[PDB]
Amino acid sequence: PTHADSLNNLANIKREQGNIEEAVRLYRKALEVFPEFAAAHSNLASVLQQQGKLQEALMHYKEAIRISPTFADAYSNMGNTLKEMQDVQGALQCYTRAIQINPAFADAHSNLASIHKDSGNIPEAIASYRTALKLKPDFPDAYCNLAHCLQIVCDWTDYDERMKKLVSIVADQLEKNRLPSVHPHHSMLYPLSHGFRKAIAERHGNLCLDKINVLHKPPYEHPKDLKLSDGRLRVGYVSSDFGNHPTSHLMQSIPGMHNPDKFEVFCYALSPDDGTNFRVKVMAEANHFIDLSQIPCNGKAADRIHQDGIHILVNMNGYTKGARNELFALRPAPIQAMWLGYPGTSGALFMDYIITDQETSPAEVAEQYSEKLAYMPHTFFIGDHANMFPHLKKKAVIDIYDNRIVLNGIDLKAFLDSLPDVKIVKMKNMPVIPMNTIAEAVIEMINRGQIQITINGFSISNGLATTQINNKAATGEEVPRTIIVTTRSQYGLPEDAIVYCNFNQLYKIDPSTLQMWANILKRVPNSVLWLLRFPAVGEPNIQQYAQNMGLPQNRIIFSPVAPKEEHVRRGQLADVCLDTPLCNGHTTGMDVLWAGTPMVTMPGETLASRVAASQLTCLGCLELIAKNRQEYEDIAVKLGTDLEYLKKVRGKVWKQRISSPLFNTKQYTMELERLYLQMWEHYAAGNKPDHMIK
Amino acid sequence: SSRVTVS
Ligand SMILES: CC(=O)N[C@@H]1[C@@H](O)[C@H](O)[C@@H](CO)S[C@@H]1OP(=O)(O)OP(=O)(O)OC[C@H]1O[C@@H](n2ccc(=O)[nH]c2=O)[C@H](O)[C@@H]1O
């Protein structure tokens, strides 16, 4: 049993180091010498859990507990395993049982907090992280995770001190080569240096390298020419987000727009089929669709990618939920590039390129990234809005304002032509329906909360009732087949004032940003800021910090999160979008621009803080991009007071969303194609990854 | 309800 104990401690150190195979070997040998050894069962279970052997893991956790019924550790680690298997009920039973055994067990409190957060119970998560910290004040994981909860609800009590402490915690962890407690995806939210952000990522990349080294795969041998593929570049899009996810809402038309003479497209799904048209469309239009969710072993899954012959393997997850970067760590393809889904560097040497653009990622900051920059010529951002919401390409109003009462629809022109007295208005072409028996009936439907009515045989629908009329149109899976009415009164917005919006999750907002917004609102009397309950419990924090800034309550109007098509349709009711500088609207930025709504942004240094400025540059609206906070406020105030200048900027957005590259998925695909071929030349000529700043 | 980018 001291022989056993030294095997176990060695195993623990081998584990901290990342030598997983060897750790396992030793735990087993520990049990081989001392079978009734609870901690070895639990630690073995715990490393098997790292390896994805969830069942075998559970079996050893239960041995541990059988041997020692009060072993709180085993219960807490078993909870994480159950959580990994999506058995939330089982995880909660384990965590609470561990806390019942030892109410001072801080890890157990921290893990209970984490499942509360994931369930969208932030107040309880915060409370349980606080208990963790109370019990163990030096607890990085729990602190940083608390910091993210607070961020999420816009709690900024002791904000600057908190930021300083996150940085310090990360500094320390990076000095000790331990896994930082700030997740790489969250790292743009805090005043970490680009070196810290790059290193955070590098460390999570290293996790993946450690996990694949147990498999002992030799390097794969990679194609040097297009001979086996009949002259076609084989491109593999790897994503867990081929389904109802923002990623598919951005890029679902790209696969089938690829040029099959010169490209052969393979989609590697990491998630199972969710039943949505998004999945249906990519499965139908990619040349080959492979479901790697059915292939849990990453060895065998990388094998497949290699035997499909991929030249460029594309990482659409980075560090997001569903990632299997282990696939990329095995390098089954000679060229591996980050694209679209992850707004950061991977920090990993197994990724060769990040696809991006000059505005998003200027040369100055190329040391922000482990990868070489592969520049698209306009923005790297793209959106499938032209295909998903073509009923928003045109609009009509009722009585002259462009954004109080709005009608959209595929058959809108025909309905207009059915009416006696429609006027057309030249934009600085917008149909206008005069105040009329018909106009009265439409407004009446809205006020009374009616779902739809009929006028001249046309179906006219209440934009608030999309899920009752057609739930697939609500999600963006189908184009609506009725005419939709959308109005400021449906959202409690005033008919007579400037509406600034921002429809992002509240976490992207920070004190400086809300201070800007307040300044702007103060400068523009009778205007409002229109935000979302995302989540709803951030609302009072926001409202309060705004009261402290001088603003009355009625100046900020919260609406609920809506189905995808309503969200997009409703941005039409706003005058201006005030983008979040800390982390811009990305998908959200394309959403609001498709409504014809100008966006004021202030590009920062991070990739996430520059994306909207790149969208806007591609859109051709340089006037909306601020160089500092005074600019940002002046632009926004100007757009709220100089109303002719507001007409002009809105007309420019409205038409540039069609005539500019921004929402042009075909053009984007073709440009993407040129860039892939550049990447391929360079490597086929025997060179290594290098910058492609066209 | 509505799907987003997450870690
Ligand atoms: C910071 C960050 O992670 N950025 C990522 C990008 O870098 C990736 O390129 C994007 C593609 O993977 S996703 C992500 O982009 P973001 O702009 O952060 O949007 P987020 O991730 O919060 O999703 C909100 C969703 O709610 C929808 N939405 C919103 C409001 C509403 O009422 N209804 C609704 O359907 C919206 O249409 C969205 O579909």
XYZ file of C-alpha atoms and ligand atoms in Angstrom:
740
model
C 0.000 0.000 0.000
C 2.956 2.443 0.177
C 4.244 0.744 -3.015
C 0.697 1.456 -4.307
C 0.786 5.020 -2.950
C 4.045 5.842 -4.742
C 2.687 4.414 -8.041
C -0.387 6.615 -7.509
C 1.511 9.825 -6.753
C 3.776 9.196 -9.751
C 0.688 8.656 -11.880
C -0.702 11.962 -10.590
C 2.479 13.806 -11.592
C 2.567 12.038 -14.960
C -1.002 13.275 -15.370
C -0.340 16.973 -14.513
C 2.519 16.796 -17.071
C 0.223 15.567 -19.874
C 1.599 12.011 -20.068
C -1.785 10.361 -20.075
C -0.924 6.867 -21.272
C 1.773 6.539 -18.640
C -0.491 7.942 -15.909
C -3.062 5.191 -16.734
C -0.468 2.397 -16.750
C 0.623 3.448 -13.265
C -2.930 3.768 -11.811
C -3.634 0.241 -13.037
C -0.371 -1.034 -11.573
C -1.324 0.759 -8.331
C -4.583 -1.260 -8.291
C -2.752 -4.405 -9.341
C -0.741 -4.081 -6.118
C -3.530 -2.726 -3.903
C -7.020 -3.646 -5.298
C -9.014 -1.879 -2.493
C -7.377 1.503 -3.248
C -10.174 4.025 -3.603
C -8.125 7.044 -4.715
C -6.507 5.040 -7.512
C -9.920 3.992 -8.840
C -11.000 7.608 -8.735
C -7.888 8.995 -10.350
C -7.809 6.324 -13.003
C -11.511 7.036 -13.604
C -10.733 10.669 -13.944
C -8.026 10.209 -16.600
C -10.107 7.699 -18.591
C -12.698 10.521 -18.520
C -10.090 12.852 -20.133
C -9.560 10.107 -22.785
C -13.343 9.873 -23.572
C -13.803 6.452 -21.917
C -16.872 7.664 -20.015
C -18.365 4.204 -19.160
C -15.128 2.659 -17.958
C -14.581 5.814 -15.981
C -18.001 5.564 -14.228
C -17.291 1.952 -13.340
C -14.099 2.978 -11.479
C -15.724 5.940 -9.790
C -18.318 3.536 -8.370
C -15.584 1.115 -7.187
C -14.043 4.022 -5.385
C -17.319 4.898 -3.702
C -18.106 1.255 -2.887
C -14.682 0.935 -1.177
C -15.151 4.309 0.584
C -18.824 5.473 0.749
C -17.760 8.952 1.978
C -15.225 9.683 -0.808
C -16.513 13.170 -1.845
C -13.896 13.508 -4.608
C -15.163 10.513 -6.482
C -18.716 11.882 -6.380
C -17.577 15.298 -7.639
C -15.513 13.851 -10.475
C -18.307 11.377 -11.298
C -20.611 14.381 -11.650
C -18.380 15.853 -14.353
C -18.367 12.598 -16.143
C -22.158 12.366 -16.011
C -22.296 15.974 -17.183
C -20.047 15.081 -20.180
C -22.564 12.321 -21.020
C -25.393 14.980 -20.931
C -26.986 13.413 -17.818
C -27.599 16.633 -15.911
C -29.862 14.943 -13.322
C -27.069 12.429 -12.538
C -24.470 15.179 -12.351
C -26.584 17.194 -9.915
C -27.123 14.144 -7.735
C -23.356 13.571 -7.623
C -22.376 17.180 -6.915
C -24.987 17.678 -4.178
C -24.083 14.323 -2.628
C -20.434 15.459 -2.514
C -21.420 18.738 -0.808
C -23.670 16.840 1.608
C -20.699 14.645 2.597
C -18.344 17.614 2.964
C -19.904 21.074 2.790
C -16.429 22.577 2.672
C -15.413 20.794 -0.486
C -14.673 23.795 -2.757
C -14.289 21.957 -6.089
C -17.703 20.441 -5.606
C -19.234 23.867 -5.101
C -17.399 25.154 -8.206
C -18.676 22.238 -10.350
C -22.220 22.643 -9.006
C -21.875 26.330 -9.980
C -20.781 25.396 -13.510
C -23.859 23.269 -14.148
C -26.081 26.046 -12.860
C -24.501 28.489 -15.336
C -24.879 25.987 -18.202
C -28.569 25.597 -17.223
C -28.985 29.414 -17.420
C -29.358 29.895 -13.655
C -26.767 32.648 -13.223
C -27.760 33.893 -9.788
C -27.334 30.418 -8.336
C -24.078 29.860 -10.221
C -22.661 33.082 -8.833
C -23.740 32.086 -5.324
C -22.059 28.653 -5.565
C -18.820 30.118 -7.047
C -18.822 32.533 -4.088
C -19.105 29.630 -1.691
C -16.208 27.955 -3.543
C -14.058 31.072 -3.187
C -15.058 31.619 0.405
C -13.759 28.089 1.156
C -10.639 28.323 -1.013
C -9.709 31.921 -1.751
C -6.917 30.858 -4.081
C -9.106 29.141 -6.696
C -8.418 30.367 -10.281
C -10.995 28.206 -12.096
C -13.785 29.356 -9.796
C -12.695 33.041 -9.826
C -12.409 33.349 -13.589
C -15.647 31.439 -14.063
C -17.335 33.789 -11.605
C -15.911 36.694 -13.546
C -17.587 35.347 -16.693
C -20.949 34.933 -14.972
C -20.736 38.541 -13.794
C -19.820 39.664 -17.269
C -22.841 37.840 -18.600
C -25.291 39.754 -16.403
C -23.262 42.999 -16.620
C -22.343 43.046 -12.969
C -19.423 45.474 -12.738
C -19.026 45.765 -8.983
C -15.249 46.248 -8.491
C -14.796 45.926 -12.214
C -11.223 47.302 -12.582
C -9.953 45.299 -9.623
C -11.524 42.151 -11.088
C -9.898 42.732 -14.464
C -6.546 43.281 -12.749
C -6.961 40.056 -10.849
C -7.901 37.993 -13.971
C -4.759 39.213 -15.655
C -2.664 38.404 -12.614
C -4.165 34.925 -12.288
C -3.369 34.254 -15.936
C 0.144 35.702 -15.668
C 0.852 33.270 -12.820
C -0.678 30.234 -14.549
C 1.307 30.859 -17.746
C 4.570 31.139 -15.783
C 3.791 27.647 -14.353
C 2.763 26.221 -17.764
C -0.611 25.199 -16.282
C -3.900 25.441 -18.195
C -5.199 28.969 -17.754
C -8.563 29.407 -16.058
C -9.681 32.082 -18.555
C -11.159 30.245 -21.549
C -9.586 31.340 -24.866
C -12.962 32.397 -26.251
C -13.539 34.725 -23.329
C -10.075 36.184 -23.392
C -10.943 39.051 -25.698
C -13.152 40.421 -22.938
C -10.377 41.278 -20.523
C -7.391 43.575 -20.689
C -4.931 40.743 -21.353
C -2.037 41.427 -23.738
C -2.066 39.802 -27.169
C 0.819 37.597 -25.945
C -1.347 36.416 -23.058
C -4.265 35.760 -25.416
C -2.034 33.867 -27.857
C -0.575 31.804 -25.000
C -3.971 31.027 -23.498
C -4.967 29.555 -26.844
C -1.621 27.773 -27.320
C -2.141 26.029 -23.999
C -5.619 24.694 -25.010
C -4.131 23.563 -28.284
C -1.500 21.668 -26.313
C -4.260 19.759 -24.466
C -5.267 18.364 -27.846
C -1.680 17.336 -28.713
C -1.410 15.549 -25.354
C -4.622 13.615 -25.914
C -3.673 12.340 -29.375
C -0.127 11.264 -28.388
C -1.625 8.163 -26.626
C -2.632 6.922 -30.095
C 0.965 6.999 -31.429
C 0.095 7.968 -34.967
C 2.988 8.465 -37.355
C 2.776 11.567 -39.502
C 0.196 11.178 -42.280
C 1.627 11.439 -45.837
C 0.144 14.351 -47.763
C -0.554 14.941 -51.511
C 1.932 17.201 -53.405
C -0.258 17.532 -56.500
C -3.892 17.325 -57.606
C -3.357 14.149 -59.668
C -5.483 11.669 -57.626
C -8.314 14.224 -57.414
C -8.559 14.840 -61.225
C -7.201 18.397 -60.867
C -9.497 19.412 -58.005
C -8.584 20.913 -54.641
C -10.242 18.750 -51.985
C -11.484 20.957 -49.168
C -12.753 19.677 -45.859
C -15.038 21.931 -43.788
C -15.030 20.647 -40.215
C -17.773 21.962 -37.968
C -20.030 20.975 -35.128
C -22.452 23.670 -36.301
C -24.046 22.200 -39.467
C -27.520 22.661 -38.119
C -29.487 25.436 -36.512
C -26.463 27.488 -35.453
C -25.107 30.940 -36.465
C -22.363 29.236 -38.477
C -24.814 27.596 -40.845
C -26.714 30.955 -40.932
C -23.497 32.501 -42.199
C -22.127 29.908 -44.611
C -24.746 27.358 -45.587
C -24.695 28.380 -49.283
C -20.825 28.231 -49.586
C -20.456 24.449 -50.058
C -22.850 24.218 -52.995
C -21.555 27.404 -54.573
C -18.067 25.896 -54.858
C -16.821 25.334 -58.415
C -16.897 21.583 -58.985
C -14.528 21.776 -61.976
C -11.726 22.939 -59.650
C -12.943 22.059 -56.147
C -14.327 19.032 -54.373
C -16.005 19.787 -51.085
C -16.233 17.513 -48.053
C -18.239 18.492 -44.985
C -17.172 16.841 -41.724
C -19.939 17.282 -39.238
C -18.956 16.895 -35.603
C -22.579 16.968 -34.444
C -25.469 14.690 -35.207
C -28.343 15.693 -37.509
C -30.646 18.097 -35.642
C -33.470 17.673 -38.176
C -33.150 21.282 -39.555
C -33.130 22.539 -43.128
C -29.648 23.929 -42.431
C -28.308 20.439 -42.065
C -30.479 19.205 -44.925
C -28.987 21.879 -47.246
C -25.324 21.291 -46.490
C -25.835 17.528 -46.678
C -27.470 17.953 -50.037
C -25.092 20.470 -51.580
C -21.642 19.385 -50.402
C -20.064 16.856 -52.756
C -19.483 14.615 -49.762
C -21.004 14.832 -46.322
C -19.380 12.814 -43.509
C -20.864 12.504 -40.037
C -17.877 12.268 -37.686
C -20.252 12.381 -34.684
C -20.696 8.644 -35.383
C -16.906 8.163 -35.097
C -15.864 8.958 -31.509
C -12.240 7.823 -31.803
C -10.217 10.769 -33.113
C -7.602 8.433 -34.520
C -10.103 6.676 -36.738
C -11.862 9.965 -37.536
C -8.601 11.596 -38.660
C -7.873 8.481 -40.681
C -11.026 9.019 -42.670
C -10.172 12.656 -43.358
C -6.735 11.482 -44.656
C -8.203 8.829 -46.964
C -10.697 11.324 -48.407
C -7.511 13.041 -49.622
C -8.127 16.513 -48.172
C -5.657 19.242 -49.217
C -7.053 22.115 -47.112
C -8.744 21.194 -43.840
C -10.848 23.996 -42.424
C -11.437 24.568 -38.702
C -14.751 26.233 -38.126
C -14.913 25.705 -34.382
C -11.638 26.850 -32.771
C -12.303 26.748 -29.020
C -16.103 26.473 -29.076
C -18.559 23.838 -27.861
C -18.373 20.771 -30.122
C -14.750 21.340 -31.244
C -12.645 18.362 -32.015
C -9.368 20.057 -32.512
C -7.719 16.719 -31.769
C -8.554 16.024 -35.426
C -6.446 18.944 -36.525
C -3.620 18.115 -34.061
C -3.161 14.848 -35.930
C -2.660 16.900 -39.139
C -4.526 14.636 -41.609
C -4.157 17.368 -44.271
C -1.155 19.346 -45.498
C -2.876 22.676 -45.078
C -5.090 23.488 -42.137
C -6.838 26.806 -41.763
C -9.097 28.576 -39.268
C -12.222 30.116 -40.804
C -15.233 32.035 -39.519
C -16.617 30.251 -36.477
C -13.887 31.223 -34.067
C -13.018 34.904 -33.582
C -9.421 34.386 -32.389
C -6.094 32.699 -33.003
C -5.892 28.963 -32.131
C -2.403 29.538 -30.693
C -1.602 26.073 -32.076
C 1.237 25.175 -34.447
C -1.033 22.558 -36.128
C -3.074 25.338 -37.718
C -1.219 26.904 -40.643
C -3.504 29.831 -41.494
C -6.283 32.009 -40.281
C -8.618 33.327 -42.971
C -9.335 36.948 -42.242
C -8.727 40.354 -43.833
C -6.747 43.545 -43.728
C -9.348 45.488 -41.775
C -9.984 42.690 -39.302
C -6.385 41.669 -38.829
C -3.884 44.358 -39.947
C -0.213 43.420 -40.474
C 0.860 45.406 -37.384
C -0.890 42.831 -35.148
C 0.164 39.611 -36.971
C 1.911 38.603 -33.700
C -1.539 38.489 -32.111
C -1.748 35.133 -34.083
C 0.133 31.805 -34.204
C -1.138 31.332 -37.744
C -0.186 33.117 -40.928
C -2.750 35.552 -42.210
C -4.685 34.546 -45.284
C -6.471 37.679 -46.477
C -9.829 37.637 -48.261
C -10.021 40.804 -50.364
C -12.978 42.560 -48.700
C -14.095 41.028 -45.402
C -13.673 37.465 -44.270
C -17.170 37.746 -42.857
C -20.099 36.467 -44.727
C -23.838 35.986 -44.158
C -26.553 33.917 -45.832
C -29.124 36.674 -45.432
C -29.807 37.163 -49.097
C -30.939 33.551 -49.303
C -32.589 33.228 -45.873
C -34.475 36.558 -45.740
C -35.040 37.804 -49.248
C -38.432 39.147 -48.070
C -36.283 41.853 -46.412
C -34.681 42.936 -49.664
C -37.554 45.384 -50.083
C -40.000 47.005 -47.763
C -43.023 49.273 -47.682
C -44.394 51.594 -45.016
C -47.710 53.007 -43.799
C -48.267 56.714 -42.958
C -43.040 59.972 -43.879
C -40.853 57.566 -41.883
C -38.985 54.494 -43.071
C -39.050 52.578 -39.745
C -42.292 52.995 -37.720
C -44.688 50.674 -39.513
C -43.119 48.273 -41.957
C -44.332 45.613 -44.382
C -42.174 42.924 -46.000
C -42.981 40.033 -48.244
C -42.217 38.053 -51.325
C -45.657 39.091 -52.718
C -45.613 42.636 -51.361
C -45.537 44.312 -54.782
C -48.669 42.474 -55.852
C -50.460 43.529 -52.696
C -49.364 47.111 -53.239
C -50.713 47.006 -56.827
C -54.037 45.783 -55.410
C -54.440 49.039 -53.492
C -55.960 52.294 -54.734
C -53.509 54.976 -53.619
C -49.887 53.837 -53.134
C -47.127 56.479 -53.408
C -43.499 55.678 -54.234
C -40.703 57.597 -52.486
C -37.130 58.064 -53.754
C -34.543 57.199 -51.124
C -31.825 59.773 -50.385
C -37.509 53.408 -53.952
C -39.891 52.953 -51.038
C -43.601 52.279 -51.394
C -45.873 54.222 -49.053
C -49.403 53.243 -48.153
C -51.527 56.277 -47.187
C -53.749 56.544 -44.111
C -56.714 54.655 -45.262
C -59.321 52.006 -44.430
C -56.626 49.408 -45.225
C -53.941 51.146 -43.153
C -56.459 51.260 -40.278
C -57.170 47.523 -40.426
C -53.440 46.641 -40.326
C -52.827 48.783 -37.284
C -55.944 47.339 -35.694
C -54.551 43.814 -36.070
C -51.389 44.850 -34.254
C -53.094 46.674 -31.390
C -55.467 43.847 -30.686
C -52.769 41.121 -30.773
C -54.350 39.339 -33.732
C -52.270 36.774 -35.544
C -53.159 37.674 -39.132
C -55.812 39.113 -41.397
C -56.741 39.069 -45.088
C -56.902 42.064 -47.389
C -57.725 41.718 -51.080
C -57.024 37.978 -50.638
C -53.438 38.545 -49.445
C -52.347 37.024 -46.168
C -51.135 39.788 -43.871
C -49.382 38.551 -40.725
C -48.489 40.000 -37.354
C -44.647 39.859 -37.133
C -45.086 38.853 -33.467
C -46.839 35.635 -34.373
C -44.416 34.019 -36.773
C -44.060 30.789 -34.760
C -47.874 30.307 -34.766
C -48.127 30.802 -38.526
C -45.009 28.907 -39.662
C -42.335 27.861 -37.190
C -39.853 27.039 -39.963
C -40.064 30.592 -41.293
C -39.352 31.848 -37.766
C -36.133 29.961 -37.555
C -34.976 30.990 -41.046
C -35.355 27.445 -42.330
C -38.092 28.518 -44.803
C -38.736 31.883 -46.520
C -42.085 33.302 -45.219
C -44.899 32.923 -47.657
C -47.040 35.696 -46.138
C -46.747 39.457 -45.873
C -45.442 40.577 -42.494
C -46.091 43.747 -40.606
C -43.561 44.995 -38.143
C -43.975 48.117 -36.052
C -42.420 50.103 -33.312
C -45.493 49.717 -31.106
C -45.021 45.898 -31.012
C -41.817 46.456 -29.075
C -42.829 49.426 -26.898
C -40.749 51.820 -28.976
C -41.838 55.436 -29.474
C -43.152 56.565 -32.826
C -41.555 59.978 -32.472
C -37.965 59.438 -31.381
C -34.596 58.137 -32.464
C -34.044 54.444 -31.639
C -30.478 53.231 -31.129
C -30.183 49.418 -30.906
C -27.867 46.742 -29.936
C -29.011 43.174 -30.135
C -25.974 41.280 -28.830
C -25.707 39.215 -25.767
C -25.202 41.571 -22.861
C -21.726 40.231 -22.086
C -20.164 42.216 -24.916
C -21.078 45.435 -23.011
C -18.617 46.921 -20.480
C -18.624 50.063 -18.283
C -16.857 52.269 -20.871
C -19.305 51.177 -23.494
C -22.432 51.849 -21.436
C -20.860 55.268 -20.557
C -20.616 56.036 -24.282
C -24.194 54.993 -24.832
C -25.403 57.189 -21.986
C -23.452 60.198 -23.225
C -25.017 59.730 -26.623
C -28.518 59.375 -25.191
C -28.010 62.475 -23.032
C -26.913 64.449 -26.116
C -30.023 63.286 -28.034
C -33.094 64.016 -25.962
C -36.009 61.759 -26.733
C -34.047 58.959 -28.187
C -33.915 55.470 -26.661
C -31.462 52.560 -26.532
C -33.075 49.302 -27.503
C -31.490 46.195 -25.956
C -32.337 42.483 -25.460
C -33.010 40.339 -22.422
C -29.956 38.194 -23.205
C -30.209 37.279 -20.510
C -33.114 38.951 -18.840
C -31.309 39.151 -15.461
C -28.735 41.529 -16.907
C -31.476 44.096 -17.323
C -31.527 45.634 -13.861
C -27.722 45.935 -13.713
C -27.743 47.799 -17.026
C -30.674 50.010 -15.974
C -29.082 50.859 -12.621
C -25.629 51.717 -13.986
C -27.459 53.901 -16.460
C -29.402 55.686 -13.691
C -26.059 56.357 -11.968
C -24.828 57.839 -15.263
C -27.768 60.350 -15.298
C -30.305 58.593 -17.529
C -34.003 58.058 -16.591
C -35.480 54.485 -16.895
C -37.586 55.048 -20.031
C -34.442 55.756 -22.041
C -33.548 52.031 -22.271
C -36.141 49.635 -23.632
C -35.595 45.882 -23.340
C -37.221 43.351 -25.623
C -37.075 39.569 -25.404
C -34.841 37.406 -27.583
C -36.864 36.500 -30.711
C -36.870 33.730 -33.295
C -34.164 34.335 -35.922
C -36.322 35.868 -38.677
C -38.043 38.313 -36.257
C -34.749 39.350 -34.786
C -33.576 40.239 -38.261
C -36.844 41.725 -39.476
C -37.134 43.897 -36.361
C -33.839 45.751 -36.743
C -35.660 47.635 -39.483
C -37.461 49.619 -36.727
C -34.243 51.080 -35.398
C -32.506 54.203 -36.702
C -28.932 53.277 -35.754
C -26.974 50.453 -34.254
C -24.467 51.174 -31.637
C -21.921 48.344 -31.886
C -20.099 47.010 -28.811
C -16.354 47.913 -29.086
C -15.169 45.351 -26.538
C -16.448 42.530 -28.748
C -18.360 43.534 -31.843
C -21.505 42.103 -33.229
C -20.364 39.517 -35.692
C -23.355 37.491 -36.890
C -25.332 40.194 -35.158
C -23.585 42.835 -37.216
C -24.627 41.212 -40.476
C -28.195 40.888 -39.059
C -28.693 44.575 -38.440
C -26.981 45.658 -41.692
C -29.379 43.419 -43.637
C -32.269 45.410 -42.081
C -30.726 48.549 -43.696
C -29.699 49.826 -40.301
C -26.353 51.686 -40.049
C -23.914 50.570 -37.425
C -21.458 52.799 -35.604
C -18.357 50.893 -34.445
C -15.001 51.522 -32.878
C -12.430 48.935 -34.052
C -10.054 47.839 -31.245
C -6.966 45.627 -31.631
C -8.380 42.125 -31.108
C -9.947 40.326 -34.001
C -13.346 40.392 -32.185
C -13.209 44.166 -31.828
C -12.540 44.785 -35.518
C -15.039 42.620 -37.345
C -17.817 45.198 -37.612
C -15.372 47.763 -38.969
C -14.421 45.208 -41.628
C -18.107 44.582 -42.404
C -18.591 48.323 -42.761
C -15.492 48.865 -44.943
C -16.731 46.100 -47.305
C -20.167 47.717 -47.140
C -18.490 50.997 -48.199
C -19.509 53.025 -45.146
C -16.203 54.372 -43.807
C -18.026 57.328 -42.276
C -19.452 54.991 -39.526
C -16.087 53.783 -38.242
C -14.714 55.657 -35.199
C -10.998 56.015 -34.248
C -11.792 56.852 -30.604
C -14.748 57.337 -28.275
C -15.350 60.979 -29.003
C -15.660 60.131 -32.698
C -18.037 57.249 -31.880
C -20.307 59.457 -29.798
C -20.211 62.347 -32.367
C -21.096 60.005 -35.214
C -23.955 58.530 -33.264
C -25.259 61.917 -32.086
C -24.927 63.296 -35.582
C -26.949 60.335 -36.917
C -29.541 61.079 -34.182
C -29.894 64.848 -34.814
C -28.913 65.574 -38.439
C -31.929 63.725 -39.860
C -31.127 64.354 -43.545
C -27.731 62.929 -42.896
C -29.569 59.997 -41.340
C -31.674 59.548 -44.494
C -28.590 59.583 -46.596
C -26.603 57.089 -44.488
C -29.630 54.737 -44.338
C -30.170 54.925 -48.069
C -26.530 54.107 -48.574
C -26.698 51.036 -46.271
C -30.020 49.950 -47.722
C -28.672 49.785 -51.248
C -25.038 48.809 -50.492
C -26.287 45.642 -48.822
C -27.210 44.497 -52.347
C -24.651 46.245 -54.558
C -21.650 45.742 -52.225
C -19.731 42.209 -51.710
C -20.977 41.943 -48.157
C -23.955 39.590 -48.560
C -22.789 38.209 -51.907
C -22.236 34.580 -51.164
C -21.182 33.605 -54.704
C -18.570 36.316 -54.993
C -17.320 35.405 -51.523
C -17.044 31.722 -52.490
C -15.019 32.587 -55.602
C -12.660 34.846 -53.671
C -12.337 32.108 -51.071
C -11.472 29.794 -53.973
C -8.623 32.053 -55.256
C -7.198 32.164 -51.741
C -7.359 28.409 -51.362
C -5.486 28.043 -54.593
C -2.832 30.546 -53.468
C -2.416 28.440 -50.322
C -2.162 25.303 -52.426
C 0.415 26.713 -54.939
C 2.678 27.858 -52.181
C 2.783 24.456 -50.529
C 2.937 22.455 -53.798
C 5.994 24.530 -54.715
C 7.489 22.968 -51.518
C 7.335 26.153 -49.365
C 5.889 26.420 -45.824
C 2.984 28.497 -44.606
C 3.578 32.191 -45.079
C 1.437 35.398 -45.014
C -0.930 35.916 -47.955
C -1.600 39.634 -47.798
C -2.573 39.567 -51.533
C -34.968 29.070 -27.705
C -31.927 30.653 -29.604
C -28.398 29.183 -30.416
C -25.164 31.171 -30.042
C -21.374 30.767 -30.153
C -20.244 29.158 -26.865
C -17.384 27.565 -24.995
C -18.019 36.534 -30.068
C -18.428 35.374 -30.933
O -18.319 34.238 -30.526
N -18.813 35.654 -32.148
C -19.227 34.592 -33.066
C -18.662 34.838 -34.466
O -17.289 35.194 -34.407
C -18.866 33.616 -35.363
O -18.309 34.025 -36.616
C -20.398 33.365 -35.566
C -20.682 32.111 -36.404
O -20.291 30.910 -35.700
S -21.335 33.277 -34.048
C -20.759 34.619 -33.058
O -21.278 35.875 -33.580
P -22.073 36.866 -32.618
O -22.295 38.120 -33.355
O -21.364 36.855 -31.340
O -23.529 36.122 -32.386
P -23.751 35.075 -31.086
O -22.605 34.202 -31.121
O -23.981 35.876 -29.853
O -25.098 34.351 -31.513
C -26.345 35.031 -31.399
C -27.348 34.406 -32.361
O -28.663 34.864 -31.957
C -29.359 35.263 -33.137
N -30.409 36.099 -32.468
C -30.093 37.247 -31.758
C -31.099 37.953 -31.120
C -32.408 37.516 -31.195
O -33.352 38.103 -30.665
N -32.688 36.365 -31.901
C -31.692 35.678 -32.521
O -32.032 34.693 -33.154
C -28.311 35.937 -33.935
O -28.733 36.086 -35.341
C -27.200 34.897 -33.765
O -27.401 33.791 -34.673
